[PDB]
Design a protein around this motif. Structure first.
Motif, PDB file in Angstrom:
ATOM      1  N   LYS C   7     -18.259  67.802  18.553  1.00  0.00           N
ATOM      2  CA  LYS C   7     -17.702  68.201  17.268  1.00  0.00           C
ATOM      3  C   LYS C   7     -17.724  69.712  17.110  1.00  0.00           C
ATOM      4  CE  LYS C   7     -16.126  67.292  13.128  1.00  0.00           C
ATOM      5  NZ  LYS C   7     -14.789  66.673  12.917  1.00  0.00           N
ATOM      6  N   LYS C   8     -18.848  70.345  17.427  1.00  0.00           N
ATOM      7  CA  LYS C   8     -19.078  71.711  16.993  1.00  0.00           C
ATOM      8  C   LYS C   8     -18.680  72.761  18.015  1.00  0.00           C
ATOM      9  CE  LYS C   8     -22.594  70.448  13.696  1.00  0.00           C
ATOM     10  NZ  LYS C   8     -23.967  70.633  13.164  1.00  0.00           N
ATOM     11  N   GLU C  12     -16.796  76.113  16.773  1.00  0.00           N
ATOM     12  CA  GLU C  12     -17.077  77.497  17.132  1.00  0.00           C
ATOM     13  C   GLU C  12     -15.940  78.114  17.945  1.00  0.00           C
ATOM     14  OE1 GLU C  12     -20.920  77.313  18.928  1.00  0.00           O
ATOM     15  OE2 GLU C  12     -21.905  76.717  17.058  1.00  0.00           O
ATOM     16  N   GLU C  14     -12.587  77.314  17.414  1.00  0.00           N
ATOM     17  CA  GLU C  14     -11.579  77.660  16.419  1.00  0.00           C
ATOM     18  C   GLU C  14     -12.023  78.843  15.572  1.00  0.00           C
ATOM     19  OE1 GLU C  14     -10.993  74.035  14.405  1.00  0.00           O
ATOM     20  OE2 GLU C  14      -9.831  73.101  16.013  1.00  0.00           O
ATOM     21  N   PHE C  15     -13.337  78.975  15.359  1.00  0.00           N
ATOM     22  CA  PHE C  15     -13.898  80.168  14.736  1.00  0.00           C
ATOM     23  C   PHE C  15     -13.551  81.419  15.522  1.00  0.00           C
ATOM     24  CE2 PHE C  15     -17.498  77.615  12.584  1.00  0.00           C
ATOM     25  CZ  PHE C  15     -16.613  77.260  11.579  1.00  0.00           C
ATOM     26  N   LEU C  16     -13.908  81.452  16.810  1.00  0.00           N
ATOM     27  CA  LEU C  16     -13.693  82.663  17.597  1.00  0.00           C
ATOM     28  C   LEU C  16     -12.212  82.948  17.824  1.00  0.00           C
ATOM     29  CD1 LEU C  16     -13.100  82.180  21.078  1.00  0.00           C
ATOM     30  CD2 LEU C  16     -15.315  81.024  20.698  1.00  0.00           C
ATOM     31  N   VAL C  18      -9.883  82.347  15.553  1.00  0.00           N
ATOM     32  CA  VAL C  18      -9.533  83.079  14.340  1.00  0.00           C
ATOM     33  C   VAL C  18      -9.993  84.524  14.464  1.00  0.00           C
ATOM     34  CG1 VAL C  18      -9.884  83.271  11.880  1.00  0.00           C
ATOM     35  CG2 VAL C  18      -9.519  81.057  12.841  1.00  0.00           C
ATOM     36  N   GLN C  19     -11.235  84.713  14.902  1.00  0.00           N
ATOM     37  CA  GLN C  19     -11.880  86.020  14.889  1.00  0.00           C
ATOM     38  C   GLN C  19     -11.297  86.979  15.916  1.00  0.00           C
ATOM     39  OE1 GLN C  19     -15.698  84.343  15.479  1.00  0.00           O
ATOM     40  NE2 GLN C  19     -15.923  83.752  13.328  1.00  0.00           N
ATOM     41  N   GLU C  21      -8.096  87.281  16.153  1.00  0.00           N
ATOM     42  CA  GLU C  21      -6.837  87.708  15.564  1.00  0.00           C
ATOM     43  C   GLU C  21      -7.039  88.950  14.718  1.00  0.00           C
ATOM     44  OE1 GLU C  21      -5.231  87.528  12.367  1.00  0.00           O
ATOM     45  OE2 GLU C  21      -3.221  87.850  13.193  1.00  0.00           O
ATOM     46  N   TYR C  22      -8.226  89.069  14.105  1.00  0.00           N
ATOM     47  CA  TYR C  22      -8.618  90.265  13.360  1.00  0.00           C
ATOM     48  C   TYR C  22      -8.505  91.504  14.229  1.00  0.00           C
ATOM     49  CZ  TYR C  22     -11.105  92.968   9.798  1.00  0.00           C
ATOM     50  OH  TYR C  22     -11.428  93.876   8.816  1.00  0.00           O
ATOM     51  N   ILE C  23      -9.059  91.430  15.434  1.00  0.00           N
ATOM     52  CA  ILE C  23      -9.138  92.608  16.278  1.00  0.00           C
ATOM     53  C   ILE C  23      -7.802  92.842  16.959  1.00  0.00           C
ATOM     54  CG2 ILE C  23     -10.626  93.757  17.935  1.00  0.00           C
ATOM     55  CD1 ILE C  23     -12.095  92.883  15.529  1.00  0.00           C
ATOM     56  N   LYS C  24      -7.030  91.774  17.155  1.00  0.00           N
ATOM     57  CA  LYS C  24      -5.650  91.926  17.600  1.00  0.00           C
ATOM     58  C   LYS C  24      -4.835  92.721  16.583  1.00  0.00           C
ATOM     59  CE  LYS C  24      -1.902  89.072  19.448  1.00  0.00           C
ATOM     60  NZ  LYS C  24      -1.910  89.800  20.746  1.00  0.00           N
ATOM     61  N   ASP C  25      -5.016  92.412  15.301  1.00  0.00           N
ATOM     62  CA  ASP C  25      -4.322  93.139  14.244  1.00  0.00           C
ATOM     63  C   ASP C  25      -4.820  94.569  14.120  1.00  0.00           C
ATOM     64  OD1 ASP C  25      -2.953  90.831  13.669  1.00  0.00           O
ATOM     65  OD2 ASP C  25      -4.364  90.263  12.075  1.00  0.00           O
ATOM     66  N   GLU C  26      -6.128  94.770  14.256  1.00  0.00           N
ATOM     67  CA  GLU C  26      -6.668  96.122  14.187  1.00  0.00           C
ATOM     68  C   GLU C  26      -6.233  96.964  15.375  1.00  0.00           C
ATOM     69  OE1 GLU C  26      -8.475  97.911  12.043  1.00  0.00           O
ATOM     70  OE2 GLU C  26      -8.345  96.367  10.491  1.00  0.00           O
ATOM     71  N   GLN C  27      -6.019  96.334  16.530  1.00  0.00           N
ATOM     72  CA  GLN C  27      -5.493  97.072  17.666  1.00  0.00           C
ATOM     73  C   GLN C  27      -4.028  97.409  17.454  1.00  0.00           C
ATOM     74  OE1 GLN C  27      -5.857  95.178  21.489  1.00  0.00           O
ATOM     75  NE2 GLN C  27      -5.459  97.088  22.589  1.00  0.00           N
TER      76      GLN C  27
ATOM     77  N   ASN D 541     -11.663  77.444   7.736  1.00  0.00           N
ATOM     78  CA  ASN D 541     -10.807  78.496   8.257  1.00  0.00           C
ATOM     79  C   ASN D 541      -9.772  78.950   7.245  1.00  0.00           C
ATOM     80  OD1 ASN D 541     -11.894  78.875  10.909  1.00  0.00           O
ATOM     81  ND2 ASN D 541     -10.974  76.917  11.505  1.00  0.00           N
ATOM     82  N   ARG D 545      -8.850  82.954   7.375  1.00  0.00           N
ATOM     83  CA  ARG D 545      -7.532  83.457   7.763  1.00  0.00           C
ATOM     84  C   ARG D 545      -7.046  84.541   6.810  1.00  0.00           C
ATOM     85  NH1 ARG D 545      -4.448  80.147  11.174  1.00  0.00           N
ATOM     86  NH2 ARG D 545      -5.888  79.457  12.818  1.00  0.00           N
ATOM     87  N   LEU D 548      -9.552  87.552   6.758  1.00  0.00           N
ATOM     88  CA  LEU D 548      -9.242  88.293   7.966  1.00  0.00           C
ATOM     89  C   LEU D 548      -8.056  89.226   7.755  1.00  0.00           C
ATOM     90  CD1 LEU D 548     -10.658  87.196  10.772  1.00  0.00           C
ATOM     91  CD2 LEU D 548      -8.297  86.557  11.331  1.00  0.00           C
ATOM     92  N   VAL D 552      -7.928  93.349   7.288  1.00  0.00           N
ATOM     93  CA  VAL D 552      -7.231  94.251   8.203  1.00  0.00           C
ATOM     94  C   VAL D 552      -6.190  95.048   7.440  1.00  0.00           C
ATOM     95  CG1 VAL D 552      -5.659  94.504  10.152  1.00  0.00           C
ATOM     96  CG2 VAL D 552      -7.477  92.854  10.261  1.00  0.00           C
ATOM     97  N   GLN D 577     -23.619  83.466  13.800  1.00  0.00           N
ATOM     98  CA  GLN D 577     -22.394  84.002  14.363  1.00  0.00           C
ATOM     99  C   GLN D 577     -22.045  85.379  13.808  1.00  0.00           C
ATOM    100  OE1 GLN D 577     -19.083  81.285  13.991  1.00  0.00           O
ATOM    101  NE2 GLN D 577     -17.756  82.458  15.378  1.00  0.00           N
TER     102      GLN D 577
END
Lengths: 40, 447, 55, 806
Positions: C7-8, C12, C14-16, C18-19, C21-27, D541, D545, D548, D552, D577
Motif C-alpha cells: 500500500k505505502k 511514497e 506518488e509523493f516523490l 509530485v515532489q 514536479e516542484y523542482i522541475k518547475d523551479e528549474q 495529493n 499539487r 506545490l 513555485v 519525509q
C-alpha cells in the motif's frame, strides 16, 4: 572471443582493382595501343 | 612456484569481484549490481583463463554464518568429481545469500568447459544446471524474499544461459529448453525485460538454419524488437543471423544496409578470422546484389586460406566466364556448403547481367538493343528486349524502347539536382539528428 | 504485511513524483531568473561613462 | 500445419487435432497466430464440442503473445478448464493479470457506489473466491485481510472473521490495522462500524473498539450505545476507561452529542464526566509537584533589559514552566521593569496570569475577582482586554457555565479593545458550538468599522463554526473581504474562514477554489490555510499539487509562506519525509519561503529523533536574514520539544547557543528575541508538558493544530504568541483504578539512569500524582509481576488505564 558459432569456422594489393579490371582487358597495355594508329 | 600466485590473485578474484558484488548488492538498489558485478563477463572468462583444481574449490561450500573468508582461504591453502559438483548443495542447502547461489553455481562449475573432458562432467554440468535451473524455477514459488535475481542475477543468468548453451551444444540439440526459454520469457516479459530469448533465439536460428526452417515466420510474430541492445555484440550477431535469413529470404537491398550496420557495430579485434569469417558471408549478399567492388578493401590475410575460393569467385563475378563459374563451383565449392552458398550459383548470371547493365546504363544515355545483345554474352535481340524489361524489373532508370525499329530510345534521368528530393529526405536526416539529441538528453539523464 | 507495505510504497512513490514536479518547475523558473539577472544587471552600460586610469 | 485439419467441421477428428495442438503448441506458435479467426469459428459454434479447449489453445497463442482482454474472454468461454486448471505458470500468469483486471474491476466497483456498475462475469470472481478458499484453508491473516480488502468489499471481509479456531487478535487488531493504512473514508466509515458492531457482540467486551470509532467515526448513537450498555450491566470500573476517555480524548460538540444522550451512582458519574475536572487538577497536581525547572537561567536572561517585546518573552517563558502550576515569580519580584513597557506588555502581563492559572478552572475567576477588567485601571483598554483574554485562558478549551457569562460581559464593554480576548476565549471554550449569541455580537463585530477587531470577529466565528460547512457566515466574511480598508480585518477574517472548515477531504474544495480565484494575496493565503485545515493529517495529493504550484509559480509571498506552512499541518502523520522535500525550499529567494521552510521542518518533525532537521536548521539559524534567524531559533524550539536531552546531543548546545545570541548585545535584537522564548518552549514545565498533535487515540488535538497555526504568524498581532502554551500535555501515565484511590505500584524500565535524568537502571513511579517520563520511555517498561495491584489494560504510552485492587 567465442561468439558461439564463429569458433567452429601496400605490397601488390591496392592495384588489384586495376588488375582485375585489366585481367582480360588490355592485357599488354601498350603493345596493341602503340600499334593502334596504323590499324586505321 | 607459479601456482602459489593464483592462490593470491585468484583468491582476490572472488574477494574483490564476488565479495564487492554481493556486499554492495545487499544494498544501494540497481547500483547493487552493474558497476563491477557485471564485470562478470570478462573477469570470469578471465577466471576461465587466469588459472586437483577440480575438487578443491567445490568442496565445503555452504558452511554457516558468513565464514567464506576462511573457506575461500581454505580453497587457497589446499593446493599443497562424482558428488563433488553437487557438494555445494551437499554440505548444506545454501539457505542464505541468494545473490551467491547462481554466482557459485556458475564460477566454480564452468571451468570444466575449458578443461575439456566432455565425457563424465557434461552430464554433471547438466545436473549442476538442473540445480541452477531449480533456482531459476523456484525463484517465484519458494523465494518470495526480495529481487536479487533481476537486478544482479538476471544479467548473471543470461550469461550462465550462454553457459547452458555451451553445455547443451557439445553433445546434442535442445527442444525442451525452448519452451523452458519461453517460460523464462514469460517471467521476463512484463516484469523485467532480459535478453534471454534473444540468446537462445540466436542459438535457435544457428541450429535451425542447420535443421529447421518454419521459425523465421514464427520470429515474425515473435519480433519483440528489444531496442535496448546493451552489449551490441549479441545484437550484432543477431543482425548477422537475420541477414543470413534475408539472404535466404532473398532480400538483398535491405541486407546490404543492415549487414553493413552489423559489421560497423563490431568493435572486435583478434584477427584469427572472427570478424573476417562472419564478414565474408555478410558480403555474400553484395555478391547477390549484382554489384560488388573489389574486395581488396575487406581482406585480412588470416582469412586468405578460407577465401582461396572467394577471390577467384569475385573474379568470376566481375567477369562473366561460364568456365570460371562452373570451375569455381565444382573445384572451389568446398568449405562454404558448411555455411551454405549454393544460392549464388543460380543467380551469378544475374549478377553478371546487372553488373553489365549498371556499367552500360550509367555509361550510356541511349544504347542499342542488338548491340547490348553483344556487349556481354547475350543471345539474341529478343533475349535483349527480354533482358531490357528484366533489366527494369523494379523501377530502374528510363529505358523506353523505340517501338518501331530504333531498338531502344533510352535516356538518362534528371532532377536529382538539388531541388526537392534532397529536401524531401532532409526532414528524416534531421529526424535521425533529433534522435541523437534524444541521446544527448539521455546522456544528461545517465546520472 | 504485504497488504500495507505494498500500500505505502505506492504512496511514497506518488509523493516523490509530485515532489519532483516542484523542482522541475523551479528549474524552468530559475533559468528565466538568471536571464533577467544577465540583462537587467548588464544594463550597467554607458550611462555617460568618464575617462580615467587604472593602477 | 493443422489449419488443413481445421478444414474439417466434424469434431471427431478435432479431438485428435487438439491433442496435436497441446503437443506441438510450443513449436507452432505462428500457426494459430493468424488462425485466430478459425479459432473464433470453432469457438462461436454451438455444435463444436471443444469450444472451451479451443479457447484454451487460444489461451496458448495469446499466452505466446500475452493479451489481456483475450484472457478475459477465456475466463468467459474457457469455463471449467479455466477454473480447475490452476497449477501452472501458463495459467497463473494470465489469471494473475485477470485478478489484476478484477482488482481494477473492484476499483470500478468503488468508483460509483449506487447500482449501475459495469457487468461482471461470475467466473472472473469465481476464480477470486475459489483462490480465496485456498486463503481460508491457508488460514493466514495475510491471506484473509489482503484479499478481503483487495476487493474493497465488506461481505468477504465480514466472512474473514468467521474463520477457524483462532482469531484472538483480528477481533481486536483489525481496526488498528485498517486505521494504520487507510486513505479513503467513503467505505472506512462502514468498515469501522461493521467491525465495532461485532465488537459490541464479541465474546469479550472491548474498549479499543469504541475508543477508536468514537473519535474517528464520532457517532452520537455509538456513544449512547456504550453509555446504554456500560450503564446497563451496572459497572463503572469498565465505563471508567471510556467515560474518562470521553472527556480526555474527545473534543467539543461531541460532548454536545453525548449530552443529548446523557439522561436517556452512574447518574453522578454522568454529571461529573462532562465537567471533567480530574484531568485538569491532576495536570495541576503534576505541575505543582513537578517543578523541575530553573530560575537561575531566568535571571541570566532577566538581566537583558530592553523596552521591546522581551518582557513578553520572559513572562511567556516562565508561564511555559508555570502554565498549570499556580505560581508567579516575575509578576512578584518587580514593578518598574514590570511596568517598563506600555500598552502591550500590560496585555501580556495580565494574560500570563491566565496562562499560568489555566488549569485552575473554576477558582481562577475568583483569583481574578480583584483583576476584573474594570477594577484596576480605566486608562489602558488593552489592560482590560488582556483581562478578559485571561478569562478566556481560564476557560481555555474546556469552559463551563461562565462561557455565557463572559458572553454577558461581552454584551456591553468597550468598542474593540475587549473583544480581541473576549471572543477568542468565547470561541475557544465554544469550539464548533455554532452558538447564536456569538453570531449576534459577531455581526456588529464585523460592522465595527475598525480593523483591529478582524481577528476577534473572523477567528471567533471560525472557532464557533469549526468545520461549519456554512455559507452565510462565510458570505458575510468573504463578501466583506473585498471592500474594507486594512488587512488585519482581512487576515483575521481570512484565518477565520480557514478555521470555519475542517477535515473536509472533499467538501471545502469549492471554498478552496473560491479563495483561490481572487487577486487578493490574503485570500489565496487563506485558501492555503483552508486546504491545511480541511486536509489535516492525511497525505492527500490534492492539496500538495496546488500547494506545490503556488509555492513555485506565484511571486506573491504571503500565500507562498502559507503554502510552506500547511505542510506539517497536513503531513504530521508521516513527519519522516519533510527534510528530503523542504531541503532546497530552505534555500529560496525570500524571507517567506525560507522562514516557512524552517517552520515546516519545525512543525513537521516534532516527535522525530531525526537530527537531520537540526543539521539543516543549522545554516538556517546562521542565515543572513534576521527574522528567519529568529524563526530558526523558534524552529529549534519546535524540533527540540517532543525530544529530550539524549534524543539529540545539541540540546544543551542550543541552550548555550540561545545564551550566546541573546546574552550578547551585538547580535540582532529581532533575531535574538526568539532565543529565551525558545528556552521557555524547551523548558515547558521543565520538559513535563509538550505539544501533542497525535494522541494514543489518534484524535488530533485542537490547540495543537488550531493554536499552533494561529501561532505561526505572530508579528501581525503579538498576543498570537500565547496559543502554543494552550497545546501542552504532561508526559505522564495514569494507572489509577478508582478515581482518587492511590495505588501501591512502582514499576520499572530497562533503560539508563541518564536517559531518565532531566534538568539506576530501573524506573520508579509515584503511586498516582502521575509520574513524568519520556514518551519513548513508555514502550520499554515492564509490568510489576510481584505487585499487589496489577494493571490489565496495556500501558504502551501515557494516558489512563485500569488497575485491579487485588
Amino acid at each position: 572471443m567465442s561468439e558461439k558459432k564463429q569458433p567452429v569456422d601496400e605490397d601488390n594489393w591496392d592495384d588489384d582493382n586495376v588488375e582485375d579490371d585489366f585481367s582480360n582487358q588490355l592485357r599488354a597495355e601498350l603493345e596493341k595501343h602503340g600499334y593502334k594508329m596504323e590499324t586505321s | 612456484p607459479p601456482p602459489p600466485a593464483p592462490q593470491d590473485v585468484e583468491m582476490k578474484e572472488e574477494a574483490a569481484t564476488g565479495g564487492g558484488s554481493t556486499g554492495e548488492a545487499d544494498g544501494k538498489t540497481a547500483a547493487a549490481a552493474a558497476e563491477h558485478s557485471q564485470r562478470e563477463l570478462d573477469t570470469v572468462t578471465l577466471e576461465d583463463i587466469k588459472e586437483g583444481k577440480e575438487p578443491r574449490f567445490v568442496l565445503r561450500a555452504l558452511r554457516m554464518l558468513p565464514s567464506t573468508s576462511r573457506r575461500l582461504n581454505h580453497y587457497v591453502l589446499y593446493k599443497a568429481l562424482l558428488p563433488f559438483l553437487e557438494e555445494p548443495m551437499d554440505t548444506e542447502a545454501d539457505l542464505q545469500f541468494r545473490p551467491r547461489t547462481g554466482k557459485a553455481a556458475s564460477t566454480p562449475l564452468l571451468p570444466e568447459v575449458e578443461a575439456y573432458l566432455q565425457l563424465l562432467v557434461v552430464i554433471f554440468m547438466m545436473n549442476s544446471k538442473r540445480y541452477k535451473e531449480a533456482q531459476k524455477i523456484s525463484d517465484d514459488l519458494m523465494q518470495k524474499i526480495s529481487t536479487q535475481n533481476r537486478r544482479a542475477l538476471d544479467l548473471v543468468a543470461a550469461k550462465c544461459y550462454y553457459y547452458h548453451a555451451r553445455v547443451y551444444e557439445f553433445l546434442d540439440k535442445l527442444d525442451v529448453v525452448r519452451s523452458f526459454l519461453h517460460a523464462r520469457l514469460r517471467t521476463a516479459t512484463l516484469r523485467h525485460d532480459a535478453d534471454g530469448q534473444a540468446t537462445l533465439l540466436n542459438l535457435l536460428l544457428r541450429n535451425y538454419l542447420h535443421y529447421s526452417l518454419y521459425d523465421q515466420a514464427e520470429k515474425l510474430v515473435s519480433k519483440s524488437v528489444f531496442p535496448e541492445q546493451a552489449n551490441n555484440n549479441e545484437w550484432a550477431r543477431y543482425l548477422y543471423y537475420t541477414g543470413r535469413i534475408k539472404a535466404i529470404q532473398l532480400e538483398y537491398s535491405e541486407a546490404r544496409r543492415t549487414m553493413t550496420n552489423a559489421l560497423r557495430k563490431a568493435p572486435q579485434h583478434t584477427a584469427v578470422g572472427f570478424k573476417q569469417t562472419v564478414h565474408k558471408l555478410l558480403i555474400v549478399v553484395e555478391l547477390l546484389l549484382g554489384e560488388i567492388p573489389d574486395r581488396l578493401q575487406f581482406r585480412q590475410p588470416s582469412l586468405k586460406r578460407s577465401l582461396m575460393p572467394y577471390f577467384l569467385l569475385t573474379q568470376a563475378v566481375r567477369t562473366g566466364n561460364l568456365a570460371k563459374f562452373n570451375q569455381v563451383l565444382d573445384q572451389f565449392g568446398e568449405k562454404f556448403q558448411a555455411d551454405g552458398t549454393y544460392t549464388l550459383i543460380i543467380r551469378l548470371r544475374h549478377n553478371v547481367i546487372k553488373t553489365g547493365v549498371r556499367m552500360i546504363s550509367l555509361s550510356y544515355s541511349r544504347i542499342s538493343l542488338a548491340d547490348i545483345a553483344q556487349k556481354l554474352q547475350l543471345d539474341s535481340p529478343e533475349d535483349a528486349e527480354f533482358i531490357v524489361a528484366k533489366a527494369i524489373r523494379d523501377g530502374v532508370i528510363e529505358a523506353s524502347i523505340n517501338h518501331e525499329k530504333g531498338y531502344v530510345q533510352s535516356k538518362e534521368m534528371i532532377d536529382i539536382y538539388s531541388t526537392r528530393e534532397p529536401q524531401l529526405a532532409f526532414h528524416q536526416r534531421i529526424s535521425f539528428c533529433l534522435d541523437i539529441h534524444n541521446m544527448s538528453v539521455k546522456a544528461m539523464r545517465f546520472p | 504485511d504485504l497488504y500495507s507495505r505494498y500500500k505505502k510504497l505506492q504512496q511514497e512513490l506518488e509523493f516523490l513524483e509530485v515532489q519532483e514536479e516542484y523542482i522541475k518547475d523551479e528549474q524552468k523558473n530559475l533559468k528565466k531568473e538568471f536571464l533577467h539577472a544577465q540583462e537587467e544587471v548588464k544594463r550597467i552600460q554607458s550611462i555617460p561613462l568618464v575617462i580615467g586610469q587604472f593602477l | 500445419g493443422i489449419i488443413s485439419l481445421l478444414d474439417e467441421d466434424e469434431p471427431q477428428l478435432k479431438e485428435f487435432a487438439l491433442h496435436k495442438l497441446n503437443a506441438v503448441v510450443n513449436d507452432f506458435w505462428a500457426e494459430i497466430s493468424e488462425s485466430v479467426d478459425k479459432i473464433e469459428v470453432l469457438y462461436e459454434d454451438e455444435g463444436f464440442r471443444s469450444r472451451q479447449f479451443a479457447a484454451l489453445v487460444a489461451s496458448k497463442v495469446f499466452y505466446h503473445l500475452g493479451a489481456f482482454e483475450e484472457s478475459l474472454n477465456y475466463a468467459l468461454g474457457a469455463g471449467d478448464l479455466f477454473n480447475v486448471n490452476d497449477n501452472s505458470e501458463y495459467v497463473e500468469t494470465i489469471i494473475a493479470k485477470c485478478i489484476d483486471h478484477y482488482t481494477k474491476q473492484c476499483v470500478e466497483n468503488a468508483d460509483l457506489p449506487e447500482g449501475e456498475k459495469k457487468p461482471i462475469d461470475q467466473r472472473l470472481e469465481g476464480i477470486v473466491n475459489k483462490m480465496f478458499q485456498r486463503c481460508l484453508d491457508d488460514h493466514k491473516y495475510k491471506q484473509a485481510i489482503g484479499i478481503a480488502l483487495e476487493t474493497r468489499r465488506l461481505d468477504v471481509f465480514e466472512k474473514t472473521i468467521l474463520e477457524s479456531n483462532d482469531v484472538p487478535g483480528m477481533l481486536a487488531y483489525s481496526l488498528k490495522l485498517c486505521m494504520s493504512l487507510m486513505q479513503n473514508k467513503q467505505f472506512r466509515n462502514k468498515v469501522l462500524r461493521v467491525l465495532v458492531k461485532i465488537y459490541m457482540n464479541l465474546e469479550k467486551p472491548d474498549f479499543i473498539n469504541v475508543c477508536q470509532c468514537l473519535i474517528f467515526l464520532d457517532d452520537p448513537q455509538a456513544v449512547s450505545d456504550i453509555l446504554e450498555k456500560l450503564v446497563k450491566e451496572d459497572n463503572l470500573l469498565m465505563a471508567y476507561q471510556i467515560c474518562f476517555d470521553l472527556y480526555e480524548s474527545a473534543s467539543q460538540q461531541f460532548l454536545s452529542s453525548v449530552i443529548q444522550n446523557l439522561r436517556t451512582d452512574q447518574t453522578l458519574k454522568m454529571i461529573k464526566i462532562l465537567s471533567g475536572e480530574m484531568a485538569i487538577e491532576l495536570h495541576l497536581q503534576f505541575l505543582i509537584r513537578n517543578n523541575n525547572t530553573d530560575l537561575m537561567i531566568l535571571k541570566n536572561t532577566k538581566d537583558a533589559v530592553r523596552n521591546s517585546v522581551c518582557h513578553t518573552a520572559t513572562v511567556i517563558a516562565n508561564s511555559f514552566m508555570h502554565c498549570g502550576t499556580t505560581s508567579d515569580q516575575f509578576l512578584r519580584d518587580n514593578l518598574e521593569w514590570l511596568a517598563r513597557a506600555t500598552n502591550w506588555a500590560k496585555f501580556t502581563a495580565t494574560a500570563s496570569l491566565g496562562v499560568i492559572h489555566k488549569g485552575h478552572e473554576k477558582e481562577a475567576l475568583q483569583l481574578m475577582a480583584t483583576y476584573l477588567p474594570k477594577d484596576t485601571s480605566p486608562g489602558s483598554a488593552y489592560q482590560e482586554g488582556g483581562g478578559l483574554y485571561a478569562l478566556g485562558l481560564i476557560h481555555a478549551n474546556h469552559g463551563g457555565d461562565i462561557i455565557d457569562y463572559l458572553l454577558n460581559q461581552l454584551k456591553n464593554a468597550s468598542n474593540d479593545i475587549v473583544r480581541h480576548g473576549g471572543s477568542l476565549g468565547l470561541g475557544l471554550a465554544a469550539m464548533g458550538t455554532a452558538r447564536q449569541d456569538v453570531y449576534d455580537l459577531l455581526k456588529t463585530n464585523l460592522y465595527q468599522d475598525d480593523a483591529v477587531t478582524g481577528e476577534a470577529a473572523g477567528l471567533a466565528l471560525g472557532l464557533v463554526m469549526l468545520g461549519s460547512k456554512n455559507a452565510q457566515a462565510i458570505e458575510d466574511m468573504v463578501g466583506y473581504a473585498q471592500e474594507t480598508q486594512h488587512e488585519k480585518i482581512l487576515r483575521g477574517l481570512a484565518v477565520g474562514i480557514a478555521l470555519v472548515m475542517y477535515g473536509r477531504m472533499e467538501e471545502a474544495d469549492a471554498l478552496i477554489e473560491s479563495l483561490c480565484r481572487d487577486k487578493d494575496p490574503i485570500l489565496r493565503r487563506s485558501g492555503m490555510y483552508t486546504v491545511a485545515m480541511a486536509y489535516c493529517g492525511s497525505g492527500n495529493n490534492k492539496a500538495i499539487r496546488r500547494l506545490l504550484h503556488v509555492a513555485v509559480s506565484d511571486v506573491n509571498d504571503d500565500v507562498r509562506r502559507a503554502a510552506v506552512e500547511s505542510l506539517g499541518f497536513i503531513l504530521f502523520r508521516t513527519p519522516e519525509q519533510c527534510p528530503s522535500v523542504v531541503s532546497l525550499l530552505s534555500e529560496s529567494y525570500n524571507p517567506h519561503v525560507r522562514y516557512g521552510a524552517a517552520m515546516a521542518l519545525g512543525i513537521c518533525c516534532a516527535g522525530t529523533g531525526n537530527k537531520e532537521a537540526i543539521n539543516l536548521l543549522e545554516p538556517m539559524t546562521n542565515d543572513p536574514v534576521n527574522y528567519v534567524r529568529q524563526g530558526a531559533l523558534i524552529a529549534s524550539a519546535l524540533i527540540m520539544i517532543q525530544q529530550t536531552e539524549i534524543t539529540c546531543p545539541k540540546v544543551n548546545q542550543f541552550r548555550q547557543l540561545y545564551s550566546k545570541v541573546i546574552n550578547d548585545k551585538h547580535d540582532d535584537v529581532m533575531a535574538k528575541f526568539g532565543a529565551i522564548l525558545a528556552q521557555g518552549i524547551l523548558d515547558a514545565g521543565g520538559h513535563n508538558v509538550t505539544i501533542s498533535l497525535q494522541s494514543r487515540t489518534g484524535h488530533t488535538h485542537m490547540p495543537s493544530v488550531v493554536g499552533v497555526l494561529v501561532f505561526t504568524q505572530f508579528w501581525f498581532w503579538f498576543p498570537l504568541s500565547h496559543f502554543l502554551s494552550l497545546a501542552y500535555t504532561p508526559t505522564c501515565v495514569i494507572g489509577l483504578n478508582k478515581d482518587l484511590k492511590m495505588p501501591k505500584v512502582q514499576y520499572k524500565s530497562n533503560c539508563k539512569p541518564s536517559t531518565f535524568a532531566y534538568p539506576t537502571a530501573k524506573a520508579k513511579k509515584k503511586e498516582k500524582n502521575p509520574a513524568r517520563v519520556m514518551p519513548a520511555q513508555l514502550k520499554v517498561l515492564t509490568m510489576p509481576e510481584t505487585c499487589r495491584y496489577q494493571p490489565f489494560k496495556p500501558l504502551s504510552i501515557g494516558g489512563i488505564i485500569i488497575l485491579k485492587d487485588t
